[PDB]
């Protein structure tokens, strides 16, 4: 059925509501999606009651306990093809004397315009509160925030921080309360806010290869798309066994594209397809890694091609 694993774990607070959509791509996002717990068995119940149930193609952890931490699998069985995806998900309770646990605190890789710009991440599927996103209550270092519009302001899923003669360093929490079946549970995120801004401390960000493993067979051939989001002067290039793809390599080929962003120059995308005429037993030994430089940093991500199981 061809497996694909997402090596990155998505840590989230326990005793809350949580969703987990299928990290899918273009040519694969087709009919039929199915979820399971560690290993293959009977799929997570669609029974709308039950704590852990699937609904609208997503995996819903209603009270999301700690004993739910692990690997979940997502399957796409169209008719001719099927795709199983391993994801890894951790649920953590807050450290003693804190309204949060360090493991679940996010950090933005690419900033937005303004002295603030905090965006409560992962609320998209909760926007389902009758089409509009529920009123977000905000915090800083665990203490409540008054959205009076002179110190801070609340708009949709964002939190604008006003330019006061203040230290903004802190661990901000966004809080919503979803109502499901005549009872509501909390939803929280924590984003760490810094000082790096104004000039251009923005290094390129590789969105495509997301530290994952793909299962392919020796005979066949593939194509690996590296997608970056940065300025048109940044650079996206693939490497293997600690070396850039040879400009005259027989099996491997590297094409560099660029998609300009009219809306925002600073945030355009760069594609670098690494073609592979034929998979070889030497490629199963190391991971393929995309790279992106800009003199303000370097970002790197990978995809590990592994031999199909017994």
């Amino acid at each position: 059925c061809k497996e694909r694993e997402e090596k990155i774990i998505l840590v989230s607070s326990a005793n809350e509501i949580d969703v987990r959509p299928c990290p899918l791509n273009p040519n694969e996002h087709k009919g039929t999606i199915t979820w399971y717990k560690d290993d293959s068995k009977t799929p997570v119940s669609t029974e709308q009651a039950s704590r852990i149930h699937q609904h609208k193609e997503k995996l819903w952890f209603v009270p999301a306990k700690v004993e739910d931490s692990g690997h979940y699998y997502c399957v796409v069985r169209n008719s001719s093809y099927c795709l199983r995806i391993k994801i890894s998900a951790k649920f953590v309770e807050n450290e003693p004397n804190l309204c949060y646990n360090a493991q679940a605190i996010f950090k933005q890789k690419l900033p937005v315009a303004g002295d603030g710009g905090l965006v409560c991440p992962y609320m998209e599927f909760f926007k389902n509160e009758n089409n509009e996103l529920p009123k977000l209550q905000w915090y800083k270092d665990c203490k409540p925030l008054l959205l009076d519009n002179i110190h801070f302001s609340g708009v949709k899923d964002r939190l604008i921080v006003m330019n006061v003669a203040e230290k903004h360093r802190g661990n901000y929490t966004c809080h919503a309360s979803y109502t499901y079946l005549g009872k509501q549970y909390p939803i929280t995120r924590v984003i760490e806010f810094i000082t790096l801004e104004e000039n251009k401390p923005t290094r390129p960000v590789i969105v495509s290869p997301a530290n994952e493993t793909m299962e392919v067979d020796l005979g066949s051939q593939i194509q690996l798309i590296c997608n970056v989001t940065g300025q048109l002067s940044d650079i996206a290039y693939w490497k293997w066994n600690g070396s850039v793809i040879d400009e005259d390599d027989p099996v491997l080929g590297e094409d560099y594209y660029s998609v300009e962003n009219p809306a925002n120059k600073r945030r355009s995308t760069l594609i670098t397809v690494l073609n592979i005429s034929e998979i070889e037993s030497r490629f199963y030994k190391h991971p393929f890694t995309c790279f992106a430089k800009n003199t303000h940093g370097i970002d790197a991500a990978y995809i590990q091609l592994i031999y199909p199981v017994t």
């Binding site: 774990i9 690997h71 360090a102 493991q103 996103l133 899923d157 960000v205």
Partner: peptide, 21 residues
């Protein structure tokens, strides 16, 4: 308004303090 999506949250966010399973 163009509110953040999940694909967008994955793309432009990461957990530096997160630990393995």
């Amino acid at each position: 308004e163009t509110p953040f999506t999940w694909e967008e949250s994955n793309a432009y966010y990461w957990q530096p303090y997160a630990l393995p399973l």
